[model samples]
Target chain A: EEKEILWNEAKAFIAACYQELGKAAEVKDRLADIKSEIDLTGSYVHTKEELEHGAKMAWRNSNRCIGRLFWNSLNVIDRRDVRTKEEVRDALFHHIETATNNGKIRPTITIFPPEEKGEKQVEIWNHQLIRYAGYESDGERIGDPASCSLTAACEELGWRGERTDFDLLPLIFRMKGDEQPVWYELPRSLVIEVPITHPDIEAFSDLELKWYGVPIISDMKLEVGGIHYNAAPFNGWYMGTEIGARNLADEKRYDKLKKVASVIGIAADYNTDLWKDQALVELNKAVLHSYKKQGVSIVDHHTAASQFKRFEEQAEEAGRKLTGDWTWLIPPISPAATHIFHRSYDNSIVKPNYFYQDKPYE
Target chain B: EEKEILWNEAKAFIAACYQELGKAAEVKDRLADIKSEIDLTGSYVHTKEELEHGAKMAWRNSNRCIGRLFWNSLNVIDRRDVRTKEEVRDALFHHIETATNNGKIRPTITIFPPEEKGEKQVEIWNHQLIRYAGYESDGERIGDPASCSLTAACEELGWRGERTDFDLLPLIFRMKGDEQPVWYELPRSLVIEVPITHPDIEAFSDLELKWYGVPIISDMKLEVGGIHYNAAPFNGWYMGTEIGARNLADEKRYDKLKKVASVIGIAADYNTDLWKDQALVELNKAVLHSYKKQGVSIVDHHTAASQFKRFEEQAEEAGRKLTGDWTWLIPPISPAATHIFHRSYDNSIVKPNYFYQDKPYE
Candidate 1:
């Protein structure tokens, strides 16, 4: 009766954990304790302090995340002792409210129960806790095209949304041994959102674009010392480009670039047009401006890259090999303008990190 | 004694080349011919048609190049018979003139002698044949900072330029067994340039920015059927982003984004500035506008990516695996706006292909 203990990975992470905390002198005894415990029970539990550090280290090792400079500052909440499905939803909603922080946007991760015997103990079906529902509207997608499949799945499960361009989706999740997933709507007051508005262009507000202040992703497994936190929802503040360049501007999402361009009068065809790119800059500017004006914590891509550069230096100073996904690290807009574009990354998957799991609801 | 004639590589390329050209029936005879020749002489010679096909195939397999849609259209000029350094220079200058094609910008490659016994028979010292000179002036770098080291090397060879921001760097290359590199300045008539100017912003011309019409890369090795062309210079029409997003705006290159932004009255710090990204658009627009107006062949990033998309489709239809360096394939400005940003690539090295060579001068 064994879960995926990954004994070597646990040993390696333990060695790094102690070395990193300047508590290497204790690793010998701890290593012995872990080895005996794992072999005896087929798995070992992490101490609360160890869990906190592991979550932070997982954030540090996330290859795709660019806003990892403040990885050490991530607030980790232990919800492993909470066993019921309703409690899991409560913890997630609490995570959303606390991390949203009335637009202050605290970076946070609230980890639920670990998997046992390689079976999920807890699973969050939503890609993110506070995402807009997406489905067809008269042959055209209403909200996020990327979320259409998930939205359809939610609908099949008897969960419904208002079918608006920005309908907040219900959190679809479950605890261990549940045949049917449970669904809970996040409190409207808890979900803080910023309506995108341009500073100079008056016509931009006509599009009526809005995005959630905090992005708490809940669908990934966080593996700490080979034990998987199957339901770990975490978030950092928004990067303006994520909303402007990708979520709003992408043809799959809001597809608002041409609409914004037409409103601002720089309209042209997509193939050779700089109008698309021009609109992107203005749209990104609107995101930055609106977020800042509302006191919602957000970062511009350039600053995020600069912070990442500092993170790189710090990681090097600590004598750690910093791995990254160069594609994700580079800004979506004006990528080559940043130093990250010139830098090469191996994209090597490091242990004690988060990983994608199949949708439990689907 | 054996040169680095990779037998497996030779076999692989021959199979692909013959299959690609509907010449598979001839491959059996040719394969045996190659094997016998290599066994006798430690190498094999490619026929003229084979060399031409190989060069185009190399272009098709070029992971870093975005203009591979025009791979089959490349004008292959064989200069392998030119034994002297002076003749090599003549062929190169002729290539520049022909490829420039009065700003029509024909995609062209002039292949000099292949390496003999893994020893260079010919080598070009410049990264690109048509690049600006960079040197120090009042403790500030003039021209392109990327070219500064090469320019210094050129100076050491007793060659000089007018020391302008748009100085046309001389071609310093060498033939077999040469003790020194032979330097030759291209005739001013052979090089065509467009002075950068904004459509609405009159002060943009005050920056007096200019760039060459065609970028002929000369310092790469064209490896085909395990044979290496040490002095193959190839060129394609400019993509606007190549000049604006990278050559002009990169911090390590021209570093003119802030200057352009200041002229356009949107100047701000590099870290969080939309102004820098704004200036990049304006600069890119200028490059496109100026080149288009001047009757020079230039493609914008969006159009280039579209053409690349078609290239990908065509490659798939032809039962070929499309390989690419995703970092290079994605546009520098508004990368996510394009379909390429969402696409993934293996970046696996395929042959016959162009390969990077160490600096001949440095």
Candidate 2:
């Protein structure tokens, strides 16, 4: 039954597609016959596909016209004062924009092997790239004068060169970073001490100190209230010998940890004795959905700022209504300390993971 | 010394070629780039190449354009009032004089197979025939409607169609000719007989009887003006007897032939059967120069005709100059048959010898 439905839909779509194609055909052929005659006499006036072949064809062939002009310009009758490369590039750029703006598509440009037969005849190149826009696809926006002017400047400097599709991307020339002392092997890591909110335990006596979620401590002689217990030191005895006098603060800490785990929905039977880390599935799903919502709002806001004045504006209003007031909780770090922390993390965790587990962090 | 001159010329030509090519390179590259962009946008303009390519491409892409138009035009369009084949031919004839007077180069239409998979489609069906101009190498005129029109008209009227190019040529339905049957077979002699003045024998009275150049009188006792002689046929007689007789006319004819031959100079015997057709060397040279002169004169005449203030004014001055008094002779058939006359002995004679027998005339 599903297959039948799919087949029926396909047939309908195909039939409608055929009908649309037929209309295109009528327009194309009529325009073609007229254009063929027009080309023989070299005057074209059609502005659309119904009259011409459309903007695409116009732009493509117009580029060819510009090419012919370029060739003629270069082969000026009186070559005593020929125009410079910059002049040529600028002229070509402006010509393309004008045609495109007028709804004429331009041909594409790409580097080709020199057409002439000889040794490294780089200058004997020709154009064969085609396009549907009235200008180049790769490169800075043709509408920008900076882009046009740069090409002219290149030409003026006799940088009359070829560029292929692959060469259209921006170039990066240099890099800068930290340097190491010649005699020193790179210091792998250094330990750092940081000030915290609570330095002394007595100052926060009202607060609880316990191993939350643990009911008992196995070793009673390990440590006692405000006292030190050393296995090999001269002084070894500790105070708080009774059950109630014992470290109930540690017990409270354990309880707090258990409460936090319950809040996070971790299994109560999770084996903390074995080395374990966060299970990401549920949390990741929640994070992903939240980010997606935020991303949608951001995009809508961006569109609004750009004066899109369409569905994006509506979307932005909806997003604002949906997203209740929330604040960011960001961890702060000094610039120098940030680097130090990053380096220490990199060396101790990232580098170790990368090297030992064959991961890619370094 | 020869090397120096030749090398200099070669270098100069090469440099000029390179310069022209360089200019072309600049133009083509720019055009190619622009075109690529335009093509990406899916619209195409119809230049000559574009139309030609589109016709083929569209056909290869499932006969999109032609099929659509044909279906629409035949099934939906109300073109029943259009001229049928017989009517169109009559109309064309009537318009011929007007079209010619208006200086329109009459369109010589023909239908060719579409330039793609259409050509390789089903032999009896699915073939797309396209209409185009019929331009011959020599500029003799052929003005007619396209063969496709004839086919369509016939199909519309329920007539069987002719499928080939040669068969289609005679589809100029109103072409008028006599109804007499033409015989393909011929008798031994097919000579174009010409009445001429007797110049070889002044003593012989002028007579109406045909005189054989290679006489074959079987009787041995025949007499002319009291002189008896053995009236025997030349056993080695074959053909070309009249051709030889004309060339042996007066000294003025002989001298003019030599002067024209001298002006033409010697030519290489390069082509097939050089010895058998030795006259072709000098003949072709003279013809080429003569044609060049005629071409220039024709161009000048065309310009003058177009520039004329009035037909009466041009006619009034037509008979007053040296162009009026000069008589143009029938040119030798081997070379300039369209320009001069054979009576002046300008026609070349292939002298007979022991290797070939003389021709007999009946």
Candidate 3:
């Protein structure tokens, strides 16, 4: 029954692809082939063109991604031949290096081997390849609270770090049948980072706030043509908020606002005037300024919203509906200030798409 | 086929409403009654409870409305009995006075008669009952460009005004089977006005800038089940931007930014550090300040967004889905600063709802 559903979904996707590509006449034959292949081997293979477009479509369909304006510009690296944890680690490191692109930042994706019938798939145990580690001591978090679980998993695998806010976490991966996952610490020199600073406030830099250059979400499964690639990771440049509003400022994450607020001389109390709002704005300004100062490719929410608006118009001109999750598309800070906040979108899930996979560590 | 579709739509709306009201057991009987009535007379009568709930539901289902937080608190004045243009004008004036509430600004709606079979149906010419007149002369507008056609229509009916920046347009409406529409100039005392002033800038108040107290939209058709109230008019408290951003600052409307920018002594050159943006922000600030100074009920975008968030939570707790048009809900100025920008909404059109009707002037 599960296979049957997957097969139907594959057919639907293929039909849509052929329609979009203006090869609708070929859909019947292609769908027939897909049905036969799925019946014979439980999965169908996608052509190179299909795979390339599928990856782009997956990014286009990503509900949480606000950077889908560059969906077509993604560099897809096919690593279907890689079967071991060592190969996974090597490929990931390669991805980080290339995607970082010496701070210019290239949007990229790397697809690993798909799950075979009655066989285990390769899985990465980290949310991102370069997230900071958090350590608990004296009832206070030393780094990012979001990384606590992954940090604990790394500790279980006998990995140790300086437990600082800027410490890069090691990558942990396993070929599903393996009894143990392998760990590889990233070289500090390979990772590009931006040190936060502000133009008007001289004391802003004294807080020593910094964030990684690339956001490589490594744990999402990419589904294409009924085949599930359980280890397809993708990277995009920061939108400022991912670092400023969420990572550093979210209460459950870095929670760095109180310290920054103190530096800014804002009263550290809940007031109707919202001192945190002012602090958050200043922090975001610093993030944007620092990224630009470092020649790192990062977009402010205003620019991102305009690009998304253009993407929508382009999609409309191409006779394709732009689907989006409004919450995710709107910037976390000053969301109403962006054009994306003014638009409603159809949030229908379409394939090939990026999906949340089961966490190997959890 | 169209009639069948309309009947089915009516049944669906009735069923959903009964379910929402926790009277699910009554749906089957009510639906049966609706089907029989539609078959016999081509329309069905709404119960008093249904009319009240349907009006509130229409407000809740309004995609462009950011004020759905007070959906249940709307004072629905059922004026379905009014059949003459004189009666329409009288009820509307009454609505303006009562809803104005001496600047307390109660959310209110007046439901006029629905379109009957083989009837002309009542219609209003103006977008809002109270709007400024615009006269075209030598490629310059004398008032609001948005009201040019309506202003002309009122002039054609032999109405005269001062033609100033804040002149109220005459109300134009026609009853079913009436050969011609009747016009009535709103009594000046019935409308409340707020003079724009900035706290820091004394020169800001000298510009003679002012806006009306209530936004009584007079053009939308209110749909209940399959019935359409062709002349229903509604009013809600101002959100500042409805006056500040669009009414005053829109290029096609008042176009007051250049004047304000000149007063503020900002360089009038085109730059990314937009002078218009700064001017708009100050204008919005002044609007908020003036409304508060006058004891008029008004909300800033931030406050509106917070209220909307609470409304979302309340709906969720009541097992009700809140649907909205994202573009309409997000305020025009500094959108991202509001919490509404960070959330996604379902844009599916549910009924009973308020829908845009054809412009009578057009």
For A244-340, candidate 1 gives per-residue lDDT tens digits of 8888988877898778888778857754559988988888899999999999999898888889999999999988899999878888888887888
Docking class of 1: medium
**How does model 1 fare in lDDT?**
0.86
Candidate 3 residues B239-284, lDDT tens each?
8778887778766778788898888777656422345555766787
Can you list each candidate's DockQ?
0.70, 0.00, 0.13
Best by the DockQ measure: 1
User: What ranges in model 1 sit over 4 Å off?
Assistant: A1-9, A28-41, B1-15, B31-42, B270-273
Following a full C-alpha superposition, what root-mean-square deviation does model 1 have from the true structure? Answer: 2.2
Flag clash pairs in model 3.
A334-B336, A334-B337, A335-B336, A336-B335, A336-B336, A337-B335, A337-B336, A342-B327
Interface RMSD of each: 1.5, 52.5, 5.3
Q: What's the C-alpha lDDT at position A326 in model 1?
A: 87
The fnat score for candidate 2 comes to 0.00
- Best-fitting candidate, scored by TM-score: 1
Whole-model Cα lDDT of every candidate shown, in order: 0.86, 0.21, 0.81
B1-362: candidate 2 lDDT, tens digit per residue: 43343334333323333343354344444345434633463211222322222222222222101111111111111111323344433332322222222221121111111112111100111011112112222543222222244344434434443342222222122111322211111111311112222222332123221211111112112111111111111111111211221221112111122332233342324211111122322222222222233221111111222222232234346431111100111111111111111112122211110011121111
Model 3 chain B lowest lDDT segment of ten: B269-278
